[PDB]
Amino acid sequence: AYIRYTPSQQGVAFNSGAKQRVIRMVEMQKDPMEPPR
Amino acid sequence: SYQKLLKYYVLNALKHRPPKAQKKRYLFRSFKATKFFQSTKLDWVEVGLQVCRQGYNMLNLLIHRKNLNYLHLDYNFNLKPVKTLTTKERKKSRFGNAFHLCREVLRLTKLVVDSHVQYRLGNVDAFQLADGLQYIFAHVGQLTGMYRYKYKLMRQIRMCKDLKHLIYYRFNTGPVGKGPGCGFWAAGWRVWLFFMRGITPLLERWLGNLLAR
Amino acid sequence: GYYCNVCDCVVKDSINFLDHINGKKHQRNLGMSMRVERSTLDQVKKRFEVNKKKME
Amino acid sequence: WEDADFPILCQTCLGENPYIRMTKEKYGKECKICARPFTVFRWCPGVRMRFKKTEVCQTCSKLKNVCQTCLLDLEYGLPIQVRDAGDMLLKLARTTPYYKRNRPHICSFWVKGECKRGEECPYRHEKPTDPDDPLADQNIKDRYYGINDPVADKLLKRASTM
Amino acid sequence: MANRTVKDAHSIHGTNPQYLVEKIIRTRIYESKYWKEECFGLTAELVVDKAMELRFVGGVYGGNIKPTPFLCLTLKMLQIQPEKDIIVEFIKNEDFKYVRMLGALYMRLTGTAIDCYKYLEPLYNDYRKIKSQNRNGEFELMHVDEFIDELLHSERVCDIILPRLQKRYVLEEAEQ
RNA sequence: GUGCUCGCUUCGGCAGCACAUAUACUAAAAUUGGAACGAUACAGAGGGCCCCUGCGCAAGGAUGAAAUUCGUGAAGCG
RNA sequence: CUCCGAACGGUAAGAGCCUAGCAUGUAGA
Ligand SMILES: O=P(O)(O)O[C@H]1[C@H](OP(=O)(O)O)[C@H](OP(=O)(O)O)[C@H](OP(=O)(O)O)[C@@H](OP(=O)(O)O)[C@H]1OP(=O)(O)O
């Protein structure tokens, strides 16, 4: 006014060794010159 | 004039309660920490012309987005028409609230910057420069379009009026008694600096409210 | 007043009709006439030939 | 109006790399098919991939059983039209999902003729596939709903030829 | 359509490709009798034909701002944005006068100050007459020196505002 | 790229050591389609929601969507 | 005896014809 996620969907041979697929999650910088989009 | 100056001084003396609060809130210190700001060293006249061009391009794109191809800001921050539209266009150009005041402020800023650009570009370059700044603050009293958006401005303009006779009757004494004394902006520019520092947040709020729409 | 047979429209003011065929979407549909700048030699032939036709 | 924690993504949309790097953005980009603010996060599926993002929002995709950025499926890998009209899907699907989706789309400066970036084009230097087949012409909203797919009829007739 | 040049134009650094003239004056240039004809397209060649057939050199006339065909043709060539070779060809033409006048005026509006002195200086020798339209409609015959002098030294010799050429002393101290 | 091995060993080289460890709304691009209360011709006025000007949830203008009598069923009492 | 103000409360509403500065950058085969 990191994350570890087991892909329980498809893991057989996608991504050879589709073991648990860890990732990195950052946030993107918001410039303070942008009106309401 | 002396009475008005003493009046402002005393009324400032009363409303002076010890300021201690806000936990040291700073601006333009977190902006430099993000990737949306970069520091450099550039001459003052260059920064002034840059700010003037940036403000003009910001207002021009506001007018462009607003689907008004029949108006033009004229590069001296004086909004001028094109074809005299009067079917329903004149009802779509009744700003009067913040566009007016932002226009006045940027007109004053670009005018000071142009007065200083003429110096480096071959103006009189003598005391004439200070005389120019003096009569520029005088015209900000009168010539500028400040009156409309806010009327309380007249108060400080009255100071800028009274303050005038604080200098000329101390400057135009002795041999120099008639001609236009150039004087200083030691008190005028001071007043307008305190003024703009005080009204930064109002225009921040108004720009936010208007950009929301 | 003025009459456009391509659009079959009646143009009233002379200026109103002048500002249709020059910009008509239907007339433009009869061919894109975006004029590209000719070569530097192309602008010389028009200058030379006119010097020999108008004057001479 | 719609924040989350982790995206409901595919197994091919994530990429052929066990460690990728996401970048959450609270309230970005306005969901394609319901027009609602949601939480856009992009990543790089692999080396020389397309820097894939997130289109279709959490409730948009969770309700209709579909991934947040390709609208195929989390369970099978078929479109949302084949998996509705049509079981047959299990022999129709595929394992080892081709990474021909995660690749850069065609450099238009090359199609015009002067791609100035040379060998350094981060886009892709192939010939623009001919326009004529309706697999040049699908969109998002007709895809996401069952109504009118260019793909789903062409794969649904693969289901009764042979 | 009078928005873009053809499809892409090297924007003059001053204001914009088409906006080197004031917005009011260009907006007036469009809606006009002389614009209604010849606006169908004029890329490189027909411009020469339209230029040699207009023996006026002026800007605005009448209470209602009425553009001369000289001024409207300057704006038309400005929208066309011809290459520098064609402009040097117009600047080198001695037979047709007002063509050379337009070439000089355009090279002044769009061009480098070094190039301005390099191409407009040798146009400071012709002692011939040139007709012009005053603001009240009445014409006047002046010298070509007056034109190029107001163009290179003075500001707004016509209705157009000039893009602030340097003083010649700075360039004489730094360059040729 | 930079500094060093009492290195193979010259001041040509080879081998090793150490510092430096992942940017990129990727593309200068590619098509796709739209709107003035704008001039011009014509006659010349009997409760809230959707918009616009707008800084104030200041202010100012507009088209579009209540009760009587009788029969029946059930609970419960002598 | 030099202190000088701006916006709204304002331009009837209309059927036929016509012209245009602006905007997306993607999913997928
Ligand atoms: O005419 P006066 O009542 O005697 O006062 C004038 C007048 O100041 P004010 O009208 O505001 O009181 C001038 O300003 P202008 O309004 O005429 O522009 C000012 O000159 P500055 O603009 O430089 O301030 C200066 O007059 P001068 O030109 O002689 O310096 C001044 O006082 P004096 O006339 O007594 O000097």
Coordinates of C-alpha atoms (C1' of nucleotides) and ligand atoms in Angstrom, one line a residue, chain B residues 131 134-135 138 161 164 168 172 177-181, chain G residues 2-3, ligand 1:
Chain B
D131 CA 23.2 39.0 -12.1
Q134 CA 19.7 36.8 -9.3
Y135 CA 17.1 37.8 -11.8
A138 CA 13.4 36.8 -9.2
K161 CA 11.0 39.6 -2.7
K164 CA 16.0 41.3 -2.5
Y168 CA 20.4 45.9 -3.0
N172 CA 23.6 49.8 -4.2
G177 CA 23.4 53.6 -6.5
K178 CA 21.3 53.1 -9.6
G179 CA 22.3 50.4 -11.9
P180 CA 21.3 46.7 -11.7
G181 CA 23.3 45.2 -8.9
Chain G
rU2 C1' 4.6 47.8 -5.3
rC3 C1' 0.6 41.3 -2.3
Ligands
LIG1 O1 11.3 49.7 -9.1 P1 11.7 49.6 -7.6 O2 10.4 49.6 -6.8 O3 12.5 50.9 -7.2 O4 12.6 48.3 -7.4 C1 13.4 47.9 -8.4 C2 12.8 46.6 -9.1 O5 12.5 45.7 -8.1 P2 10.9 45.4 -7.7 O6 10.0 46.0 -8.7 O7 10.7 43.9 -7.5 O8 10.7 46.1 -6.4 C3 13.8 46.0 -10.1 O9 13.3 44.7 -10.5 P3 12.2 44.7 -11.7 O10 10.8 44.3 -11.1 O11 12.1 46.1 -12.3 O12 12.6 43.7 -12.7 C4 15.2 45.7 -9.5 O13 16.1 45.2 -10.5 P4 16.4 43.6 -10.5 O14 15.5 42.9 -11.5 O15 17.8 43.4 -10.9 O16 16.2 43.1 -9.1 C5 15.8 47.1 -8.9 O17 15.8 48.0 -10.0 P5 17.3 48.2 -10.7 O18 17.2 47.8 -12.2 O19 17.6 49.7 -10.7 O20 18.4 47.5 -10.0 C6 14.8 47.6 -7.8 O21 15.3 48.6 -7.0 P6 15.9 50.1 -7.5 O22 15.2 50.6 -8.8 O23 15.7 51.1 -6.4 O24 17.4 49.9 -7.8

